[PDB]
């Protein structure tokens, strides 16, 4: 059985997701259009910038996050934003088409659509391999959300100052996930282990993106196309 | 008569305008859409940001500007960008509708469309009065372009270091304008004087916009909607 408190964490983490993810992708029309030089760069920056806004809404609703100091919240966020984005992006990734399908044919993002925004297959290849490996796991909603909140609360990120408290927080969430799979997932298996394997991949994808972002952000004709939010989060200050 | 050199300045200043102003307003579709909270703020920031890019293209083509030092070019630009923008905006301002008409009905910018982007009638009132006062003058192309290049080369802006050279430049351009009106404008009249009157207005409109921009740029939920270029030009660094 799960304790009353562990089901409250599950209740409130699932609801936080539903408030911050729109299965209709309707706000995509408010972005700058995509063009198919780095022609896809405006529209993706607007897209990621919007997602950062949603990750911050989700994070404000993880039990315990609201109570860390302001510096710790920012350091966690700056270091894990790109990985949470890769995680929530799994919900729109279709196994067929091998593309992110956000509704219409303009928001179908093949791998060629991403290269026209400054990235190379040295990142896109492991990214897509990550997206099918996650898709084949067939996670429940409650598992997907737990995975996100755990990746956020990792202590081993640059800039944290209260490891003991954020690690205590992360460990309470591992416990809830393990308990969920035991009681509520059939056969049990090593789902928990394949899930924790996926965390170690995001560390490697994080690093690649940050290298390629640095090259883009040094070229003033490309940083000009970013949003203020993107520059604040993926910058070093 | 005008000397061979004064007609070269007129030739090359008119061509610079034609390269940097699109009477079709076709690139407006690449911006973020307008919405009618400050709902018009995305689309206008994208709009002004695009115009700053065109003012820099024009300025690089004024005889003598390319030869000032890099610091002087930037100081001139930072201080006069908003006024050149107000000047080139006259070309799309219709006397009827009392709005800027950039083609379709989405790019008709009444005065209400601008208030939904953070500005008040304490700036919009003298702005529209400026736009009809300029419209009624019925300037030739060669006069409109000269007016812009003169307003750019004023020495009395914060940050200039070589007044004597940029004033020598500005004075050569006043001479060309006076000569143009004598030879090429009918009756002569005090057109030159009403034109120089319009410069003194832009100084007053400049100040109002910069006050209201400062209030907007201090609110982080509104600076988030600006572009990097706008933040770099209207910031103080």
């Amino acid at each position: 059985m799960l304790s009353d408190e562990q089901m409250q964490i599950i209740n409130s983490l699932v609801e936080a997701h539903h408030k911050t993810y729109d299965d209709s992708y309707s706000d995509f029309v408010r972005f700058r259009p995509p063009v198919r030089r780095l022609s896809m760069l405006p529209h993706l920056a607007d897209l990621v910038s919007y997602s950062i806004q949603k990750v911050i809404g989700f994070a404000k609703m993880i039990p315990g996050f609201r109570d860390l100091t302001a510096e710790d919240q920012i350091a966690l966020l700056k270091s894990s934003a790109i990985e949470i984005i890769m995680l929530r992006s799994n919900q729109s990734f279709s196994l067929e088409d091998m593309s992110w399908s956000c509704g219409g044919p303009d928001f179908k993002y093949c791998i060629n659509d991403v290269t026209k925004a400054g990235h190379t297959l040295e990142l896109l290849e492991p990214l897509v391999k990550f997206q099918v490996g996650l898709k084949k796991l067939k996670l429940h909603e409650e598992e997907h959300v737990l995975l996100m909140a755990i990746c956020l609360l990792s202590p081993d990120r640059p800039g944290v100052q209260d490891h003991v408290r954020i690690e205590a927080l992360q460990d309470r969430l591992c416990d809830v996930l393990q308990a969920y799979i035991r009681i509520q997932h059939p056969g049990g298996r090593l789902l928990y282990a394949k899930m924790i394997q996926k965390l170690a991949d995001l560390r490697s994808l994080n690093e690649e993106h940050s290298k390629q972002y640095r090259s883009l952000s040094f070229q003033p004709e490309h940083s000009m196309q970013l949003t203020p939010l993107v520059l604040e989060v993926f910058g070093s200050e | 008569m005008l000397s061979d050199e004064q007609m070269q300045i007129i030739n090359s200043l008119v061509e610079a305008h034609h390269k940097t102003y699109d009477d079709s307003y076709s690139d407006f579709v690449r911006f973020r859409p307008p919405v009618r909270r400050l709902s018009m703020l995305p689309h206008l920031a994208d709009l002004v940001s695009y115009s700053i890019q065109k003012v820099i293209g024009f300025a690089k083509m004024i005889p003598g500007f390319r030869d000032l030092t890099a610091e002087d070019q930037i100081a001139l630009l930072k201080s006069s960008a908003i006024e050149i923008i107000m000047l080139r905006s006259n070309q799309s301002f219709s006397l009827e509708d009392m709005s800027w008409s950039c083609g379709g009905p989405d790019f008709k910018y009444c005065i209400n469309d601008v208030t939904k982007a953070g500005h008040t009638l304490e700036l919009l009132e003298p702005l529209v009065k400026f736009q009809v006062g300029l419209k009624k003058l019925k300037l030739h192309e060669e006069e409109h372009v000269l007016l812009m290049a003169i307003c750019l080369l004023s020495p009395d802006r914060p940050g200039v270091q070589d007044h004597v050279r940029i004033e020598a430049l500005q004075d050569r351009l006043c001479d060309v304008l006076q000569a143009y009106i004598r030879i090429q404008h009918p009756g002569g009249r005090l057109l030159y004087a009403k034109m120089i009157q319009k410069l003194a207005d832009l100084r007053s409109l400049n100040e109002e916009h910069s006050k209201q921009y400062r209030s907007l740029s201090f609110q982080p939920e509104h600076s988030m909607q600006l572009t990097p270029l706008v933040l770099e030009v209207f910031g103080s660094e």
Partner: peptide, 9 residues
């Protein structure tokens, strides 16, 4: 840090 602080309410 400006935008993130305000966003973090």
């Amino acid at each position: 840090h400006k935008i993130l602080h305000r966003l973090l309410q």
